């Protein structure tokens, strides 16, 4: 996260670290949506242009973390993956359309002060909250700059959702309805973005109607990190929820 701050303890109890076994590496963020299911970006697991094709045994998920590098004894829980599910129309060839994947855990993780699932939006929640100007929150252990470049602890930044024509006009990439963009404009003064290693993490919003946190996006892509006139692009969780629901219903 560029131009963010240190998370508070227990601020983002659905935050998951995708951790490579060998070499020991932060791969991506992810999020806890139930005791057995983790949500992430497809490109965290499959990205042929960079020879990325992670199997279940290549990774661990670390849940309840705050420190990036420490083993947080008595706090974090570490789960092995039972199965990876990538959206079958995930478009790695062009624009990362439908950049979403599910991971079923081997065993249920126990909830705690530090470990708790986020809600997924329904149509009404999406319609209410996904509006230009409305701010969501992005968290992660990714780099602090495009290029100390790496954070000691989990980072947080609040960013406004951006008007769809402004998103389109910032890039040559073909945008789809399965994406939205967020971030401040040059004239707004405030800054912030996701960066390398924040991929797959959640963009969340707090419903003012029921005081619950909803994951509206997944950190997908951008052009650099925190560049003026560029924006971060997020997978539109609600648009792909029918797929989410179908995978969970048949495999869960």
């Amino acid at each position: 996260i560029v131009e963010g701050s240190d998370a508070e303890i227990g601020m983002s109890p659905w935050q998951v670290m995708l951790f490579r076994k060998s070499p020991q590496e932060l791969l991506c963020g992810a999020s806890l949506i139930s005791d057995r299911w983790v949500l992430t970006a497809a490109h965290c697991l499959l990205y042929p242009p960079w020879d990325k094709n992670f199997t279940e045994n290549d990774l661990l998920v670390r849940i309840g973390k705050h420190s990036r590098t420490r083993y947080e004894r008595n706090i974090e829980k570490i789960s092995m993956l039972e199965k990876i599910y990538i959206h079958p129309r995930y478009n790695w060839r062009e624009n990362l359309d439908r950049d979403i994947a599910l991971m079923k855990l081997k065993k249920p993780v126990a909830f705690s002060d530090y470990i708790h699932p986020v809600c997924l939006p329904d149509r009404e929640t999406a319609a209410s909250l996904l509006q230009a100007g409305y701010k969501g929150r992005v968290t992660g252990w990714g780099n602090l700059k495009e290029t100390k470049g790496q954070p000691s602890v989990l980072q947080v930044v609040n960013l406004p959702i951006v008007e769809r024509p402004v998103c389109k006009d910032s890039t040559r990439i073909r945008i789809t309805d399965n994406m939205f963009c967020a971030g401040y404009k040059p004239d707004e003064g405030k800054r912030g973005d996701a960066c390398e290693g924040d991929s797959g993490g959640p963009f969340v919003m707090k419903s003012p109607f029921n005081n619950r946190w909803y994951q509206m996006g997944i950190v997908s892509w951008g052009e650099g990190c925190d560049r003026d006139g560029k924006y971060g692009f997020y997978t539109h969780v609600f648009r792909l929820k029918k797929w989410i629901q179908k995978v969970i219903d048949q495999f869960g």
């Binding site: 949506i33 919003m205 707090k206």
Partner: peptide, 30 residues
């Protein structure tokens, strides 16, 4: 089963404590 309690943080919503920047979010919602 975890749906019922989703999105309610043990150290914040469950204790009626607010984090230091959630108001920024609320204020953006109109």
């Amino acid at each position: 089963s975890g749906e019922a309690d989703c999105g309610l943080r043990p150290l914040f919503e469950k204790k009626s404590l607010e984090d230091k920047t959630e108001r920024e979010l609320l204020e953006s919602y109109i």
